[model samples]
Structure formats: C-alpha cells, structure tokens
Target: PKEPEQLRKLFIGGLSFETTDESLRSHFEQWGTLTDCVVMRDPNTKRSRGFGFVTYATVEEVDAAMNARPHKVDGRVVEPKRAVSREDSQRPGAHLTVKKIFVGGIKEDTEEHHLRDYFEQYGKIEVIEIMTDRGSGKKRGFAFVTFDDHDSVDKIVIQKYHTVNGHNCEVRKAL
Candidate 1:
C-alpha cells in the first residue's frame, strides 16, 4: 500500500477558554491562508475546549505555523505542531512512546474529570484529553492520557487492563 499524503493541518494547544474560531483563524492567518480552523467545544456548554486544529492550504503553511512556535492565542501561549492522524499513528513500526497512553473503549459518557479521577491515584497527570467528534462533539470512545512521571506509566501498564465507567478499557502506549 502507498503511504498516505502528509496533511497540512496543525494542532494548536494551550488555548484560553474564550477563544473563538474566528480569532483562532485570524491569529494563524499571519502564517498563511487557513483552509479551516476548528476550536473544539463542549457540545452541551458551548465553551472552548482549550485546543483546536488549523488546516492550511499547503505544507509550506504548516511549516510556517510550526516554525512560529510559542504563539499567543487569546492571551495564552499556545504550542503549534504538525497534526498526525489516528490511522497513521497506529501503523506498524510507528514511533510509540511511554509518556502518553492510548485509552480505548471508553464509555461515551466518560468525561475528562472522570478519567483524571480514575488515573490520578497512579500518578500526577499532565493532561487527559478525550477524543471527540468534530461535528457532533461526542466522545470517540478513546482518549490520550499523559503523565508527569514515566513511573506512573509503568504502574498503569502493570495493571494490563482498566475499567472506566463500567467499560473495560484498552490501554497502551500512545504513538
């Protein structure tokens, strides 16, 4: 099979809750023309979720956005990096790491707080992000959890399995 084409999308993190799609696009516009700018939000609350995806018209624009690191969006220092697709990350021989864990089969109702509550006993959590549908804003039954210490990852890995919200979750190192 042929390799997938590289995406011109960039992931922007550390956004303030007040960030708007228009503002996010405008902030990144300095780099290049934006094909799309999405600021994920809580469907029920309609509030900013502190991260977003910015798609540019070409790879050059993605490079420009990433090169302009430590960008300030809505008064917060945001980190912009190349966005990787879920499929690509799951490919064989992918460079997976231990600092972040891929949590799968999560119950749809599970929230970030619930994840933190369940995993905090293991160690200090740097961030816990539940993947959500771009359009529906519904949980995608998975998440990425990062720990401040690698030992915490070892602790979780030792368990082999984790039950969250009555569902058996598949936990493995994230790529």
Candidate 2:
C-alpha cells in the first residue's frame, strides 16, 4: 500500500478456491524471478481468498509471468496484471504496459508546446499528440503524452497536479 514503486508486482486473480500460497509461489516462480508470493486472506477467517500476489525481482520477470499465458490455476483461467497500488491493483488492464499517458483536464486552449515543455522537466519525452474530435477536427480536451522510457511516466503520475504554462492539469499514465 505504499506510494509509488509498483513497476514489478504482478496481480493474480480468479484463483481456484483450492489455490494456496505454496502452490502460488511454485506456479509463478516458473515465470518470475519471483522471490515472494502471498495469497490474500480474510485475517479473521484465515482461509484462502481466491486471489494472490507474486512479486518479482525485476519488472522484466513480471513481463514473463503475464505474457507466458494460459495461466490455468487449479482448473480456472487466472486473471493476471501488473499491479500498481492497493486501491488499483485488482484491475487487469492492458494499459499498464504503456510508456504513454493520458493527460487530461488540459484546457482546450492549451498548446502542445506548453505540455511538451512542462513534461520535459520530468523525463525526456518521445511524443505528445493532443486529441481532437471529428466535428471537422476539433479539440478533445486531452493529449497522449509518450515518453522515451517507462520509468519517466512513474515520475509524472505521482504528482497531484501539474501547471502547464501556468494552468493546472492532470497527468496520468494512460489506461
């Protein structure tokens, strides 16, 4: 539940009622540099919770566990994801792998260069495409901020707000 640093933990869900910590570790270690594995529980009941966590030594190992698919666990196909935080970990979203972000709440009047200059301070940016609608091409009040490194996005998302050329905006990793 700590802030930041979720780049390597894999969230595994849809577990069979029979799956346990010992087997969870055994299953994930095959695809991870997996050093730790724990099945979540009802502390009062002390029984299996039908979900678990597998931690890897590096994000690279987490990549293997996710893509090396068909993760059938005790007869059920498991839901796997790159976990981010306690509040958001249960979701199995494909966007967690993106090096790009969906920066919204950007004033429709804001210019692309303003976004580029503001985010450049956080990381070396690769591309930033401001979104537009289909009404003969108009503003969408959003932008896709792409960075040179995945590490760069981690730096930007933790901020509550970012001032772009003096206007506040939301910079979040794309979902």
Candidate 3:
C-alpha cells in the first residue's frame, strides 16, 4: 500500500501588526509539534509585516489547523492556507503576460518622467509605476515600465546599462 502525501508548511495572513513569533506559536502549537513559526518583520523598522508562517511536523496537524475555521490571533481572524514555493507564484499561466519590465535600484528622487524619457526611445510607453511601501508610503526603489510592444523589452534588455537620477538600475522581465 502507498502512503498519502503530506503537507508540512502553511502560510498565515491577516495578522495584526502587534502579532509576534511567540504569540503565533502559542496559537498554533496546540495542533501538533511545530517545526518552525515565524512572524515576518521589516528589516529597517523591525515591525511586523502583518503576516507569518507556521510549519508542522505532520500532515494531520496541518489539517487540524485548516479545519479550525475562524482562526483568531490577537482578536483578529486570520487566513491559513497551504504554503506554495516562490517559483510557483511566477509559473507560466499563473499570471497575465504584459509588455512590462521591472526596473530596480531606482533613486528616491527619480520621477515617472525620467523613466518615460529614457525608455520611450525604444517604443511607446503605456505605463510607469513606482512601487511604494503601503505603511510608510515610501518609494520601494523600483518601478515597472510597460511598453507598447515586446520588441521594446528585447531592445532594453540588450543595452549594457540603464541609469536614472545618477543611479544604475537593474532591468529585467516582469513576471
């Protein structure tokens, strides 16, 4: 007889900012032996990122946690689901295909016009978005530039360097 597949890791979201690693472990430990429990935090501020992960020693423990609906931690209901690998999020057919490129290491003062002026030489630019932190509303030091055609992406990638506001940025295909 063959054994059943086992799931050991889980992703827990909807956490309160006050939630801590010890608090998360205390809530889920009743289900089974915990291999690991972590509450993700911002490296700069050391504040909870409002999510955490829990790992159990057995599949049954994972099932127990899943079935325990309305999972409340620190008076807030949370979502608990089986964790997926980082690669899975970027797998083909997982997301829409857009003529977009990721530009990273952008200078804080860099503006949309600066990106548009530099990249428009290749093709028509449709969108330029600078990512920002939700809590702090600060620039994440990256942006997404969408072009009118795929050829523009190829042209940009072939270039040796991309600089904006005196910062050398990294350019790559957006997943």
Candidate 4:
C-alpha cells in the first residue's frame, strides 16, 4: 500500500455530459492500471460537474495515459492535461493565479472558436474545449479555457470578468 499522493491524479476535462465515472474509468483502464476514479458532482443535482479525477496506481500509468491521449475523449475531442497540485488548489489571492477558466451559463449554440476568439484578446490560449452531451449532442452550459501562463489568467480575470458575451462568468485555477 502507498499514500494516495504518490499516485498521480490526472484531470480529464471536456467530458461528455453523458459519460459517467464508471464509463470513463473503464475506458482509461485499457491504457493502464487505475487506482480510483472520483467524479465531482453538484451537491444538489448529483450530476457530474463535467470534470473528474482519475488516480493511477503509479505515476507511470498516469504518464502513459496522458501521453496516449492528448486531446480526445470517447470519439469526440477533448483537452486532457495534468491537474494542478493540492497545494495550488488550496492557495489564495495572488497565489491563486489561474491556468484554466471554467465558463458557465454558455449558450447551447456557443462554439469553441467563439470562446477562444473572445478570450484571445487577453493572451494566448493553450486550449479551449466545449463539453457536449453525447446523448443529446447539446452544449453543457460550460467549457474549459486553458491559458498558456498564469499572467493570461490574471489578465482575463481583471479585464474580462463580467464582459464575455454580456454574461457574468467566473475564472479560476483548474483544481
């Protein structure tokens, strides 16, 4: 047995709204051994927040999965990247500089390029992924916007906090 921290936890974003923890875990298990898969859900709705944590039995397995699939999920495309550490997740203020901004209340017709075009005003975008429900093929009211660096994160927060599409949105470090 080993401490859970020793096992790397990879963050899988742009998950299909229809995809479940069991399905995703099973899908990744084919790539390597997995320890535990935890999908965060809304407290009241009990639906997945469109993001989840996949813990591999070893760091090697984590790396394997990350390398195997850089940008695809369940046939559709997604942005798969390493998650920030718990220390960063718990940090506050200026230290809380964001690398990814989770945009919610997005219209069903919103496209990834549109989101990118808007955020591109601040800085370079590393990736932009829009979550869609596999069953319905509809927007999930949210998406993940990854920036190249922390400076872009801070800039977006200060300049575009409430001006994107005339909707008040939030930006934060992807935990």
Candidate 5:
C-alpha cells in the first residue's frame, strides 16, 4: 500500500482470505465514521490479497479506531495501524513529542464543549475537536484532545486511560 496522504486514509494488513471491504467497514463503524473501505484483491483470482485500506474523515477518527483496538472482520482479527504518510516522512515535528489523545466511545450527543470541559481538568487543552458527519451533522462518536505539552500526555496516559461510554479509548503521542 502507498503512504497515506491524509490521516483520513489508513493501510490495513494481516487480513484473512475471505474478508471483504464491507466486512472491514462494518467492523470499524463501531468506532466512528467510515468514509470508504477498499480491500485489495488478486487480479487473476479476484480473491482477497490479505490486505486493504480504510479511510475515515479525519485523523482523529483514524487514531481512535486503530489505537490498541482490533477490528473483527469475517471472524478474523484484523490488526489496524497507522501507515505513515509522506507529509510525516520528514518527521519534521518528531522532536517535539507533543502528544495528543484520541478520545472515543463518546455518546453520540457528545459535543466539543463537553469534551473540552472533561479533558481540561487534566491540563491546559491545546485543541479539542469532535468529528461530525457533514451530511447528517451528527456526532461521529470520537474526538481528538491535544494537550499543551508532552508532560500532560504522559500524565493522562498513566492516570486516566480507559474506555468511556462502553467504548475503549486510547492515548498516544500524536503522529
């Protein structure tokens, strides 16, 4: 698979023989909005090539969906990880180590202000974003909360890391 151009797209590997794009998309739908799903196939056999790509609407959605969360597609456990993009190839900001928390399993009614209030209790929030569907204007059940610095991210990961609203959540250094 090629490098992702944006966080919205991710290259997924380790697929079972029968997995289809719909199967993958349906599995990830539990996490958040799924913009597209494409399963690679052999040209001659038209069989699954044991890999695929998925595209969400934003980096936050991609982060929340992949972080320590395995998607079950076609009764097979699929490992989804972030494939680095050319934009991140230079590692231009890698030295900063400014961590970002990808929050998910939020209620559909969850709002940006609500997330801001909840995460602000940890430290100064650098940015709080709640992804919403452009067509329906509905919450995508996930958000990205960036802290002011690395220390804050470390603290949150250590003390308050878990699922909220029955959905598993994850914290990691923002890529």
Candidate 6:
C-alpha cells in the first residue's frame, strides 16, 4: 500500500559479522538521511544473520548512494540493492506485493479461529486459507493468513517466529 517508503529501504547483504547498525549508517551517511538501520539477527538466538537494511530519506538519495561504488564495510565489500517485496507467487511480477503470511508447522487439527486470534493482533486479516486435502477434505497442516495491510506482514517479519495454539509455527512471506 506504501510506495516511496518502500523504495528507500535498501538491502545491505554480504555484510560481515563485525558490522552493526552503525556500520551501515556511517557508511551510507553521505548518501541520505539515516532514518533507520539495523543488523539482521535472529531475535531468539541473539546472534547476527549477517545482513540488514538502511533507510534513506528519499529514492533520489538511494540512487546516488548505491549508484556510486561497491560498498566496502568492515573491510568486506558488501552487496547493495534496492529491496523488493518478499512474497507470494514466483509468476512474473506477482511476487512484488505480499499481504500473505505463510504459517508453517500448523497441525492438521488446528482450526482457523486459532489462526485468526493469533494473527489478527498484528493487523486486520483479510482471509485465512488453510490448504486442504482434496482427497479426504482435511486441512493439510499448513496455511496462509493474509492481512488487510502490508504493514501487518512487516510486523510479523520482525517477530519472525510465532507460537500459535501450541504450534511453534514458522512465519514467512507466502509463496
């Protein structure tokens, strides 16, 4: 639902473990305003995932920054790219927008209400589709919960892992 705000968020990959939030800020500092930056980490483990994002004030600033030279941070040359939507169908351009959260590890017996109650707290849920087996007409043990707002998915991304009704469900952008 939001645009330029999306474009300003840059992907900083190939990052070294030594780098933190400030590594990106001070490096990309001249390119644009450091509105936000972070080192990607597993919140549960408290360890580095070795990648992250930094926000620029505007898209134009992003162009000037990434357009220049290979970003060398913490002595390692990192890869920089404009971020893209991370979910849904791999078909052509369909993956570009995702309001769907794929909840893996859901038990076949779990009801949709349990999903709605757990997921709806993040945002308005548009629909909850639990894949069903056509043969026995039973839920296939996994599901997709689509939110009314994309921000809801973003919130879930940060949370990363969710325990839904005793299921240590894994959350990811649906595909």
- With candidate 3 superimposed using the best TM-score fit, by how many Å does residue 164's alpha carbon deviate from the native? 58
Q: Distance from true position, residue 122, model 6, in Å? A: 38
Report how far off residue 55 is in candidate 6 (Å): 0.7
Question: Is candidate 2 or 4 superior in TM-score?
Answer: 2
Which lDDT tens digits does candidate 5 get at residues 74-168?
Answer: 87777664444322455652223455877767859777777766667666787888878899988888788887654455445544456454445
lDDT of each: 0.75, 0.74, 0.77, 0.66, 0.67, 0.77
lDDT of 5: 0.67
Ranking by lDDT: 3, 6, 1, 2, 5, 4
Between prediction 3 and prediction 6, which has the larger TM-score? Answer: 6
Superposition error at 18 for model 5 (Å): 1.0
* Number of residue pairs clashing in candidate 1, backbone atoms closer than 3 angstroms, sequence gap of 3 or more or interchain: 0
What lDDT tens digits, residue by residue, belong to model 6 across residues 36-79? 89999988986879888888887668667755557798899987
Steric overlap count per candidate: 0, 0, 0, 0, 0, 0
Q: Which stretches of model 5 miss by more than 4 angstroms?
A: 1-5, 87-175
Candidate 2 to truth, TM = 0.53
Q: TM-score, each model?
A: 0.48, 0.53, 0.47, 0.46, 0.46, 0.48
User: What digit string (tens of lDDT, one per residue) describes model 1 on residues 47-158?
Assistant: 8888888888876676566556668888889866554333244465232235788889986888888789899987689999999999999888999999975545644664
Which of 1 and 3 is ahead in TM-score? Answer: 1
Q: Which pairs clash inside model 5?
A: none
Model 5 lDDT, residue 109, Cα: 70
Predicted structure 2: lDDT: 0.74
lDDT of 4 at 172: 54
In model 2, residue pairs whose N, Cα or C atoms come closer than 3 Å (at least 3 residues apart or on different chains), thus clashing, are: none
Selected candidate, larger TM-score, 3 vs 5: 3
Best-matching candidate per TM-score: 2
Candidate 6 lDDT (Cα, whole model)? 0.77
Over 114-166, each residue of candidate 3 has an lDDT whose tens digit, in order, gives 89888998668999999898999898899999887654665466456998878
